[PDB]
């Protein structure tokens, strides 16, 4: 329930973003979407710290217009509640690399062909206060 | 025509936002509108280089919910075409202080009393590339 909403961010595929923010003290649920629609975004982060009953459990997936998505599930956590980070985004064609501030790197397919990326939201336990392009 | 557009920016008096963009080599028209509501603008931004048949002339005027706003005109410009620059905006309820990259300040009282600003959005022949908070 706290992150700050982009729009008009037209990325195209080659450039590198970098997000510099603050995690809450209560790192405990975050959301992430980064497309070009609401219900067309291209990656969607959902980390959960404790919610069902699990730990540092991370959930990853795509979605086209609301239809479907491959949702994956990675188990790296390279931060801490009340911890300032910040973690690198690159979106090209051919597949999507993303690094952390301290992890190996990690890249998923992006079964859709988007050259652009116009939408960007993002709401949880996790405070942005820099957005920086390229 | 040209300027990302933010929201759930929530500032407070007391803050202080530094933005750093590069305006296109025809710096001809700009837009900027940072408020709570789309009609509920404090302060909004819009130098012309060349116009009706001006030069250099800033205007610069406030509304609510699509109210009224004094608008008045500055005619200072510190800044060229094809040239990047950062503004330094600070909102506070007692007054408005704006800083540029190269001359003095200038401030202008908010008849409004908003204590947070929830809505940001330029387009024009700026290009912003990175949004710092405090």
Redesign the interface.
């Known amino acids: 329930a706290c992150?700050?909403?982009?729009?008009?961010?037209n990325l195209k595929p080659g450039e590198c973003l970098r997000v510099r923010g603050e995690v809450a003290p209560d790192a405990k649920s975050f959301v992430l979407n980064l497309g070009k629609d609401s219900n067309n975004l291209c990656l969607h982060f959902n980390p959960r710290f404790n919610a069902h009953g699990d730990a540092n459990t991370i959930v990853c997936n795509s979605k086209d217009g609301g239809a479907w998505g491959t949702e994956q599930r990675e188990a790296v956590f390279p931060f801490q509640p009340g911890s300032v980070a910040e973690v690198c985004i690159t979106f090209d064609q051919a597949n999507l690399t993303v690094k952390l501030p301290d992890g190996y790197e990690f890249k998923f397919p992006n079964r859709l062909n988007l050259e652009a990326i116009n939408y960007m939201a993002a709401?949880g336990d996790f405070k942005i206060?820099?957005?920086?392009?390229?």
Chains 1, 2 share one sequence.
Request: charge should be negative; glycine fraction near 8%; hydrophobic fraction near 50%.
């Open positions: 992150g700050l909403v982009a729009s008009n961010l709401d206060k820099c957005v920086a392009f390229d």
